[PDB]
Scaffold this active site. Structure first.
Site, PDB file in Angstrom:
ATOM      1  N   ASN A 125     -14.067  -0.335  -6.320  1.00 25.81           N
ATOM      2  CA  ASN A 125     -15.140   0.591  -5.914  1.00 25.81           C
ATOM      3  C   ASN A 125     -15.906   1.197  -7.062  1.00 25.81           C
ATOM      4  OD1 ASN A 125     -13.265   2.488  -6.775  1.00 25.81           O
ATOM      5  ND2 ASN A 125     -13.772   3.970  -5.201  1.00 25.81           N
ATOM      6  N   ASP A 143       0.872  -1.214   0.000  1.00 33.38           N
ATOM      7  CA  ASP A 143       0.000   0.000   0.000  1.00 33.38           C
ATOM      8  C   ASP A 143       0.895   1.246   0.000  1.00 33.38           C
ATOM      9  OD1 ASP A 143      -2.251   1.836   0.936  1.00 33.38           O
ATOM     10  OD2 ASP A 143      -3.294  -0.101   0.932  1.00 33.38           O
ATOM     11  N   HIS A 195      -3.718   5.954   3.791  1.00 26.97           N
ATOM     12  CA  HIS A 195      -4.464   4.748   3.378  1.00 26.97           C
ATOM     13  C   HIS A 195      -3.838   3.493   3.895  1.00 26.97           C
ATOM     14  CE1 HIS A 195      -5.738   1.825   0.202  1.00 26.97           C
ATOM     15  NE2 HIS A 195      -6.866   2.489   0.226  1.00 26.97           N
ATOM     16  N   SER A 235     -11.111  -1.330  -0.026  1.00 24.65           N
ATOM     17  CA  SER A 235      -9.829  -1.276   0.644  1.00 24.65           C
ATOM     18  C   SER A 235      -9.927  -1.481   2.143  1.00 24.65           C
ATOM     19  CB  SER A 235      -9.185   0.114   0.461  1.00 24.65           C
ATOM     20  OG  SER A 235      -8.625   0.311  -0.815  1.00 24.65           O
TER      21      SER A 235
END
Length: 279
Positions: free
Chosen positions: A161, A39, A69, A224
């Site tokens: 998404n 990430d 994130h 996520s």
């Protein structure tokens, strides 16, 4: 063990019903497992990680998470308050820049790195990788995820998404990894969650409280956020001896809460991650 006033998603993963607020789990808590969070990095200094997180690789000028994130996702895997597997070891691999973006060639290199790097780590209960990232279909990205899984890592990836079929996204569309959709606190498919035959499981993804950079916390939404629930669950179940990296996606699907979610399109599994923990 019981954690009162837990984030809804933790309570959900240990419940046969929505609407509760206590997370129940076996005290082993993923001890002896390891989870790679591939990430934007992890703020390993956050008190919530208790020294159990570290950065192991970056492809950029710093290993720091300048975004948040990756810290949030790592928190849902393994932070003391916000995490599923509260005693796992967390290893950060920064394949995304501080804007949250990254080239596929870097992402591939990071997956290959994890497949080798686990041989440099102590993970007697097994190894998981959490990939809260993705883009358009790429056979090369899917193959990298497949190799990582083949190497003996439980690979959990976000469905995406787009409120669309995940077949058109990578590494979501790789058959051999665990592709994770998102649900909300009322057991609805999250409005943004991708769907399709390639999904393996859903996890909590709408309004998920976890760690953030600057020693802070916040609630955000996405596939996520669902992915690290599943990654942490795998680590937890592997420490318990219930499953293994090769089999953990299947095991989680076998033991999931079934038929509880609404607005699941015909042809997508109706399976919500569940630890089946009985005090």
């Amino acid at each position: 063990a019981a954690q009162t006033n837990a984030p809804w998603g933790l309570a959900r993963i240990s419940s046969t019903s929505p609407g509760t607020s206590t997370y129940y789990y076996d005290e082993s808590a993923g001890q002896g497992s390891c989870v790679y969070v591939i990430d934007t990095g992890i703020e390993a200094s956050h008190p919530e990680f208790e020294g159990r997180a570290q950065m192991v690789k970056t492809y950029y000028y710093s290993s720091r998470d300048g975004n948040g994130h990756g810290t949030h996702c790592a928190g849902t895997v393994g932070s003391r308050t916000y995490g599923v597997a509260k005693k796992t070891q967390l290893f950060g691999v920064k394949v995304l820049d501080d804007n949250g973006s990254g080239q596929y060639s870097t992402i591939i290199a990071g997956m290959d790195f994890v497949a080798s790097d686990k041989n440099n780590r102590n993970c007697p209960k097994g190894v998981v990788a959490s990939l809260s990232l993705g883009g358009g279909y790429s056979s090369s990205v899917n193959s990298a995820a497949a190799r990582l899984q083949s190497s003996g890592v439980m690979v959990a990836v976000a469905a995406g998404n787009n409120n669309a079929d995940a077949r058109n996204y990578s590494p979501a569309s790789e058959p051999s990894v665990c592709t994770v959709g998102a649900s909300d606190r009322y057991d609805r498919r999250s409005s943004f969650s991708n769907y399709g035959s390639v999904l393996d499981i859903f996890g909590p993804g709408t309004s998920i409280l976890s760690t953030w950079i600057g020693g802070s916390t916040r609630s955000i939404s996405g596939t996520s956020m669902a992915t690290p629930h599943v990654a942490g669950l795998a680590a937890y179940l592997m420490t318990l001896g219930k499953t293994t990296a090769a089999s953990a996606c299947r095991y989680i699907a076998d033991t999931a809460n079934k038929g509880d979610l609404s607005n699941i399109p015909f042809g997508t599994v109706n399976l919500l991650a569940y630890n089946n923990y009985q005090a």
